Amino acid sequence: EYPTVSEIPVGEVRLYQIADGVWSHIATQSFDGAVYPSNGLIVRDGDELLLIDTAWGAKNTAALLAEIEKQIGLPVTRAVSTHFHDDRVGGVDVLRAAGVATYASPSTRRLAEVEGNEIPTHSLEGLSSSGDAVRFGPVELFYPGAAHSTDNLVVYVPSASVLYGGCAIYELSRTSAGNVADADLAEWPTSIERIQQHYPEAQFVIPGHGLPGGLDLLKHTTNVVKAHTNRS
Ligand SMILES: CCOP(=O)(OCC)[C@@H](CS)CCCc1ccccc1
Ligand SMILES: [Zn+2]
Ligand SMILES: [Zn+2]
Ligand SMILES: [Zn+2]
């Protein structure tokens, strides 16, 4: 049902309807000689769409917009990137050219600039302290604290009980840590506990990469992070 790495050539994007007015988008990218799947989110709000994250590069993000037009047919008017890595902001220039208003926290914008990654134009205020939440159209944005990166945001869709954990949450199939070069390993389990405490009602949990599940993904991620922490 849910699209996998095997079934998506790099350059194509799949949409997966989760609920009324809520989709994930799934793309793949080559990196260091392997191929990785990647998720984002699409959320309807009236007669327009809110996009969560790019499809990991310009080419994929072009295909994303085309696939949205084909399968949904409503305009993307705002986008939020949930941290500064290229699987979240790579393609922001494509979005902007298409008239999308692109957003990220000041921390994400600052880190993207440092990294040399594309910089969302608008700033999300009210998210700089762990446990901060703000409304953004049909979703709530939440800063759980440092985890996969110091700037990582999570996204909740109240009407659908959909929790988008982004890359701070791992799919169950991943039993080893991925890119933790920018991670706060020491804080990551505590940040995951904040997510659990704030969104215990979540029914559909979407990781940044791979298969969705339920709130168990949180404990799973903590397990994997703690096991990496204990590198021997
Ligand atoms: C292997 C390179 O991972 P990235 O640093 O890609 C550069 C943008 C990471 C940013 S979150 C995305 C890929 C994470 C992943 C690792 C292993 C399996 C599935 C996804
Ligand atoms: Zn990342
Ligand atoms: Zn990622
Ligand atoms: Zn596990």
User: Domains of the chain: which residue ranges?
Assistant: 1-232
Q: Does 85 count as an annotated binding residue?
A: yes
Distance, in Å, from the CA atom of 165 to the CA atom of 144, rounded to the nearest integer, reads 10
167 marked as binding residue: yes
CATH 3.60.15.10, domain 1-232, yes or no = yes
Minimum-distance ligand 1 atom for the alpha carbon of 208: 11
Residue 179 a catalytic site member: yes
The answer for 171, left when phi > 0, alpha when psi is -120 to 50, beta otherwise, is: beta
Strands 48-52 and 122-123 turn out to be unpaired
Under 8 Å CB-to-CB from 4, ≥6 apart: which residues? 37, 211
Residue-wise burial string across 151-160, b where 16 or more C-beta atoms lie within 10 A, e elsewhere: bbbbbbbeeb
60 catalytically annotated? no
Tell me the technique behind this structure: X-ray
Q: If you measure from the C-alpha of residue 226 to the centroid of ligand 4, how many angstroms do you get, rounded to a whole number?
A: 11
Which of the residues 25, 83, 151, 152 is marked catalytic? Answer: 83
CB atoms within 10 A of CB 71: 13
**Resolution expressed in Å:** 1.5
